[PDB]
Design a protein around this nucleic acid. Sequence first.
RNA 1: AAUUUCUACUAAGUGUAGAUCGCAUCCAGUAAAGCGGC
DNA 2: GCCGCTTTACTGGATGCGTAAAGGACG
DNA 3: CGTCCTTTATT
Length: 1223
Amino acid sequence: MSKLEKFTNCYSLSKTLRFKAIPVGKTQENIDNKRLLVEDEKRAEDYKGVKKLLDRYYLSFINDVLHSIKLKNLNNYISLFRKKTRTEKENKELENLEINLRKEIAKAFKGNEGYKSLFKKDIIETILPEFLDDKDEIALVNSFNGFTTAFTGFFDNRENMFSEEAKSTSIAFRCINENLTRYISNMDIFEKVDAIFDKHEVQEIKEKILNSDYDVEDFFEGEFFNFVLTQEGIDVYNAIIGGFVTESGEKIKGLNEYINLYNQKTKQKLPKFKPLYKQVLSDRESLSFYGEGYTSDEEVLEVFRNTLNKNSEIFSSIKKLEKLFKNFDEYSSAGIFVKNGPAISTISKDIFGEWNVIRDKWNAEYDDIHLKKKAVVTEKYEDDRRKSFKKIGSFSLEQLQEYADADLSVVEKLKEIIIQKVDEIYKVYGSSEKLFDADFVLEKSLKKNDAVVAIMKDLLDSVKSFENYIKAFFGEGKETNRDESFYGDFVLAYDILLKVDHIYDAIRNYVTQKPYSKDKFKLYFQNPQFMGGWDKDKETDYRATILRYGSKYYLAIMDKKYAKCLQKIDKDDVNGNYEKINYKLLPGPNKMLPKVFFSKKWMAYYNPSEDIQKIYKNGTFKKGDMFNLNDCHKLIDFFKDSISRYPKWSNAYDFNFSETEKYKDIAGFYREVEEQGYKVSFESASKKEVDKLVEEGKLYMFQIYNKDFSDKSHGTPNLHTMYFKLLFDENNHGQIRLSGGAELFMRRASLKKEELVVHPANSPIANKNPDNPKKTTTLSYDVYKDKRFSEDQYELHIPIAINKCPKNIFKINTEVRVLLKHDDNPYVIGIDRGERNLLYIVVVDGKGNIVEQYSLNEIINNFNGIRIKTDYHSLLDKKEKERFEARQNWTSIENIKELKAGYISQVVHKICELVEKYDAVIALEDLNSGFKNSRVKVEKQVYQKFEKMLIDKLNYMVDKKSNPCATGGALKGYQITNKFESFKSMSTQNGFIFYIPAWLTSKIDPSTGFVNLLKTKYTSIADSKKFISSFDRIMYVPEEDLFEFALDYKNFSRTDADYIKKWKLYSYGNRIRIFRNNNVFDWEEVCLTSAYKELFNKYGINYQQGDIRALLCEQSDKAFYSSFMALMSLMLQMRNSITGRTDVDFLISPVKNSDGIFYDSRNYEAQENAILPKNADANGAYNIARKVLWAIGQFKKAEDEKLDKVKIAISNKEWLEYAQTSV
RNA sequence: AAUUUCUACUAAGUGUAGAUCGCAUCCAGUAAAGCGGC
DNA sequence: GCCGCTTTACTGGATGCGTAAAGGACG
DNA sequence: CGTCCTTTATT
Ligand SMILES: [Mg+2]
Ligand SMILES: [Mg+2]
């Protein structure tokens, strides 16, 4: 009611409506006969090609400067960049330095005198014909001699590359804003970690990577940046961090690889380096050597047959390798060795059937010498055997035969396994013989052929496992005696079997690539700017315009031969007529009023006083230090008079300008032109003539259509279908404008009609909803699946502009604060993320009362009494594992972004419904860049998509049921978030949306506000001794069977935050602990009081003795304290959760509230309408919402001039005094 | 199981409900398999 | 599980445009 | 000389 109505007509944004275009009458017949589509098809392919050559020239022009660029005073930027103490004056000083560094790069591209010609028709007619040396590339640019405006959008994408501003697509942005900070940040890390770099490691990287031409320390000096400005330098720089791969496959290690080895050997966390991003428009060949993938299906086959058949060496390698293990007994059992790795536990199984016997057998050997009888099994003796067992490089066949008990002979059972595994491979060929024949011809493309691939994948994985098994027998020796008679033959075969490793690589990279599909192609109809705008004065120029015949809108296109065929038409008084558009638009008043009145054609006709042309030149009409008021007034009066004397503007638009003496700036004037320089009207044009123009092929005509436009549809239209209707409805006083830049694509069919899944007519189809009481539909017509891709389809993308002239101008975050300061019962929505519930909603009133809370794991909807509850969290979990198991098995990877998107729209709808009902602000978690990472497989990508599509909705929120001409409807939709420019331009609040920190949101007691601010991990006995003494009392309360731990927080460290300070903790309830190593459960439920009684009996403590603090401190045993502090750890462990278990995720508190009862969320999850959180997840969203109620409390005090300056970012100390006082 | 398109439907018979900014460019991120060092 | 190289997939953020009339070249 | 494709102007 009150709050939302204020937010209408707030700002201007554009959207795009999409429509299927259906050819009318003989339209498509004439389009085929004139071969128009094949020309645009052949063009859209050549258009990608010409662009590729254009990139070649740009990259060449890009590099001429970037090779030769020198950055002035680079150290100065570095100096202020690494200062731990800049002021509000030096912070503005480094920025002005950062701006000049990009300018230094930017003007060097523009300093060239060929710069401006890179984006005009000259580059295609002139420059590229000179640069190119191919006679075919010369011929593909010539066909575009007539179309150079079809590149205007491509040229804009390339001037961004030469921008000076901090823009993401700028080259200057890449080198300075991105590469420098990454380069500087590593310079801070190099110095910190330079100590751990061996002198050979410096020489290793210098000889192998740097070629002795540069020192390694050089690439961390300030002045050496100039090398890395190109891809040539970046490729070398990244190699210093990561290393690279030679021809022979040697993994040359980089600095990030060495720092890693040191931190695994000294158990530290020293920082690794950040690689550098690529340079814009670089075609980057990678330094690491890799064998190129196969181009086509035929190559893959010819390799597969020739390399993998029995005749080829790869089989001969196995054929001889089987011979070696057969005669295995002959060679010296001291000469053969089995490598040591974690993969040997499998080896122990293959001989005698147990994993850990080889480890256990050896452990008996190491123990007996180095187990003195005093200890029997100290932690140091058990833990040192692990150090020795992996340090061992390999095992000889006799140390394994010595471990083996008779009659088991290791050398014989080795012959058994190899004989078992090479028999398997000879049988996979039996199935795959159909792949090896010379005659075999593939039925379907390799990607469309899941049946042939699974055959190759099965033969390749069978060869891979036999080779991967044998690799362990090398032993990496470096061994005193090797039966080199054996290993000589072995090395000969195994290096040749190693050839499959490159085939396994390259085949995977071919088969698993998405198959060929024909993208839709833009239709030009022989005009480079086809259908660019709708102005009636341009109808001949663009050659397309819109037509209306009642409830149906058509798109008419005029053939190049008959450009003015729809202008000679007139009204037919008696017979049918079309409604023809009369579109009129004045784009860019700041760029169209001076462009015309100072243009060569009209500069004479309107003789601007020499005073004028010196005002526009000096820019005194602009606000700032050049600003003059009367000059602005005079510039206005010249434009005003000139328009009245301009015919095609004055007649077309009805102009009302307020008195020039009332304009405060030139912007106020241009706005009135813009708001009134748009008029859409309709004229009458004969149908029998226009239709004659379609049959004659002089005019092409499609119907604009979606399923709402069907005569069989009686249901609520799609939201965009409403927009389309308002564009031409006479109640749209400019709210939604018809913008230019429409496009028309052609998407050829991608599926065959005969191939489709069809539900045959008059045969019953089963309904999937178990709530739907009609489990069958019997239709009299066929239901083809994906029928929209079974036929060719025209596409029409029409951009629209909403609120191009915004009336209501004010700050939105400020206006939201204003109405919160005055709302008597404001509401807050709390939305909390999780991995057990994707999203949890909590709605609260101004007093923190819960009105609503439910999980959004499932979307529940009712229409006409037909409930349907979709389990989207299950749908996401199943599609995720349908891509995981797809990636493993080389099959098709299903798409999941749409499933997440379809979920959010159902979610977004629900929040907007809550926002409309309760007039509630929205509360989200303050998440920076780091939190996106997780330890388990996330759908938390849904959360990032949840904000984007929710913010996008709140930019222009509409209800499709309200009247469009009413507030909230289609023409007056609510705008309650700041315009979405980027995710990085965001602050702590965005209109109704508040991002708030999550500290103490979940592990806090709702009933009392109690929080765990004690550190309980065990460090020493004395630390434990001081701990127990600090508590006011530790007693047993027998009437309740509980232990009581009264404390004043001021006796512990870092308890400054808490308000109440004095709490009494009780060992009430059970907790959940996770194991550290068969067993039914990986967790147990400890009973605290039944465990304090347990601990206190093991050490002989009389816990009934009143106060027990001095009694527990009397102990001298470390084991007592290391477990006591553990029991103390669980009592303060409020949030108890278990991975992947639906049952467990509960919050329980060890404090009695005002009525002396503990908060156990389980006592709430059973309730339908609970007044407190039901679980740790709802507890999160509840508090996220209350943290915002605190902020509303700060708005109710401050005054509207200072409401903008209130800090809504909670202080961790302020939130505790609030959570403890609210109850 | 239809769709401008996506999702979920069949929703009373060629459809229902919700959502939907297209296009081009630069760049990055995640997952998987192989490959080398701990 | 950490570090690094590759290849395939699918996915996502940040930029530009959403223009009529002047301007010029051309048969 | 009219027609079609190119460049332009910046609250
Ligand atoms: Mg509908
Ligand atoms: Mg995934």
